[PDB]
Ligand binder design. Sequence first.
Ligand SMILES: [C-]#N
Ligand code: NA
Ligand code: NA
Ligand code: NA
Ligand code: NA
Ligand code: NA
Length: 320
Amino acid sequence: SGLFITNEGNFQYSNATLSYYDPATCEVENEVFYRANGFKLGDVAQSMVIRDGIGWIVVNNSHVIFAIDINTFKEVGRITGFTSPRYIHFLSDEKAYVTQIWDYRIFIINPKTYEITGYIECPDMDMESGSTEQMVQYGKYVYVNCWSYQNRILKIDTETDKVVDELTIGIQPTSLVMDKYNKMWTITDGGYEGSPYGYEAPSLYRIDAETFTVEKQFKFKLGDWPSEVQLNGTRDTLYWINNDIWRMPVEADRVPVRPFLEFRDTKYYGLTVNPNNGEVYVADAIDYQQQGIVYRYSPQGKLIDEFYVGIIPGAFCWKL
Ligand SMILES: [C-]#N
Ligand code: NA
Ligand code: NA
Ligand code: NA
Ligand code: NA
Ligand code: NA
């Protein structure tokens, strides 16, 4: 297999980069999109998905998704015109959703023709403070967290491409996963000091997908800035960032007393679990200025390897 690491770079500086790591050789190649194509991705490489041999790289502040050949890293296509794209979720070969910040609409695209083919309007949301983020599928429904200056999960009917329900929670749910019991997990960041929207103790929520109801809420400390719920491949061990890297069984009624990886006065910023072998990768932004590092741990928190990537490594994509 292989591991892609997206590096956000510094917002408004256009130093986003792509890295590729071979776990069998413990070798990283940096700046791989430039190496293959002789131009740069742009500003804030946010997320990446692979479908049918094609890697889709969301470049948040370059209004673009690139489609790359996952072996040569060559650009094979692109889609432009996104307000500020976040995440891409495929419904079929000919339909995906692309979420957005600073927009009240989710973009619908045809990945086969490289086209925007529609919009989903979100209720009670404007361009000024709009935000849609990560997506999980539940039968014909997609659930989407509304992050920046928002406090909702939305439920979208993917047949009609319409928002059919919403749930209000604590401010700024950051991420979204679905465990093996069809329970969604989200973790809020709690906003920031000086925010026009608010600042509070963040929470981790377990939400039933069937009924769209909160089953558990674990409240953290004011000043915490949690993020990045992730699951293992079996979808029964939840991971997240809150200073440390934390994990717990998705069946837990209590939060852990010991983290998977202790805070070290750095900036743990991205997180993935190998879906096949359980190995945990942690992307550390360090101070958000210098070259970041990824840490590869065994399922027991033994460091297998670590390697320098680009600036502000934020997201991972497995090539299996
Ligand atoms: C600001 N994340
Ligand atoms: Na950048
Ligand atoms: Na933007
Ligand atoms: Na709004
Ligand atoms: Na967003
Ligand atoms: Na906070």
